[PDB]
């Protein structure tokens, strides 16, 4: 309390809809910082954006112990477009959440569950994508969870899975991965984009540089990119070797802006799995001789 600023507010409402569409978001979480960051994100969108408004209701997981709370939760899940859950590791409440959400699985334009007990993680639904479609890396992550590292194991798994899916079911898996990347970001504007991305795709439809799916930032030169690349912990040392085979990819900025990059991500993973260092350049212009 003295060392962590905590809020008495669980519920953020737009002060006035006006013309705008309403998005309804329920969240269940264990971290006070993610509670208050979502509030800050929702609260900024409500005051600036002129077609979208967001209602946010949520409980820290422990607050579902009372029936006062659990009852409004059920009713909020009933009306929700988006359900979010993260770090739900108590057998008791886990099942209250499953019971509450399971009925509305088809209602929800999406349900996003970040590392929780397996029962809750099966609520994950983003168009065609669920925990079912993790090829044979459903088995691996499911049981690592049962036992921040956890957040990264699932992130670095996601590109390995895209190849075994058809393209639409791969973009849905990528959209998930993007939304998980934003969440781990955890910044206010991270979570703003998170809610605008999910709203855009599932609820209400630099001129050049270097890009890696696993880096939140573009790079405007090779030195920064490689310095980043070498510090990566998810890759064999083999790939940092300057004698490693290195393949240039050329792509359109459009698809990196759109987030419609599933096949681009799957390409980078295929080449990395084969032991290739990768440099993906893009441009917004029609002259790709510049980045080459």
């Amino acid at each position: 309390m003295f060392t962590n600023v905590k809020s008495t507010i669980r519920r953020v409402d737009p002060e006035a809809l006006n013309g705008r569409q309403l998005l309804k978001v329920v969240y269940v979480v264990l971290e006070s910082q993610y509670q208050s960051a979502l509030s800050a994100a929702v609260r900024n969108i409500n005051r600036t954006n002129s077609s979208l408004a967001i209602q946010l209701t949520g409980y820290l997981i422990e607050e579902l112990r009372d029936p006062e709370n659990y009852a409004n939760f059920k009713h909020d899940v009933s009306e929700a477009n988006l359900f979010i859950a993260s770090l739900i590791f108590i057998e008791d409440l886990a099942d209250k959440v499953v019971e509450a959400v399971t009925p509305y699985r088809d209602n929800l334009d999406a349900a996003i569950v970040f590392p929780s007990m397996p029962q809750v993680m099966r609520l994950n639904k983003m168009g065609s994508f669920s925990m079912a479609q993790l090829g044979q890396s459903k088995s691996a992550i499911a049981q690592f969870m049962k036992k921040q590292d956890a957040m990264l194991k699932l992130l670095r798994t996601l590109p390995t899975v895209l190849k075994y899916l058809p393209v639409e079911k791969a973009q849905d898996a990528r959209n998930f991965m993007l939304s998980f990347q934003y969440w781990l970001g955890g910044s206010q504007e991270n979570l703003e984009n998170f809610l605008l991305m999910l709203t855009d795709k599932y609820v209400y439809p630099p001129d050049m540089g270097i890009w890696h799916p696993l880096s939140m930032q573009m790079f405007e030169n090779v030195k920064d990119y490689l310095e980043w690349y070498n510090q990566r912990p998810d890759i064999s040392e083999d790939l940092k070797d300057p004698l490693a085979p290195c393949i240039g990819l050329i792509m359109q900025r459009t698809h990196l802006v759109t987030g419609d990059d599933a096949h681009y991500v799957g390409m980078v993973q295929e080449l990395e799995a084969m032991g290739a260092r990768v440099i993906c350049v893009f441009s917004g212009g029609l002259d790709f001789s510049k980045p080459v």
Binding site: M1, V5, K6, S7, T8, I9, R43, R47
Partner: peptide, 15 residues
């Protein structure tokens, strides 16, 4: 805008 945001976080704070 920032000042009003700051004051209202202060009032909502669990202190």
């Amino acid at each position: 805008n920032l000042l009003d945001q700051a004051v209202k976080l202060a009032a909502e704070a669990d202190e």
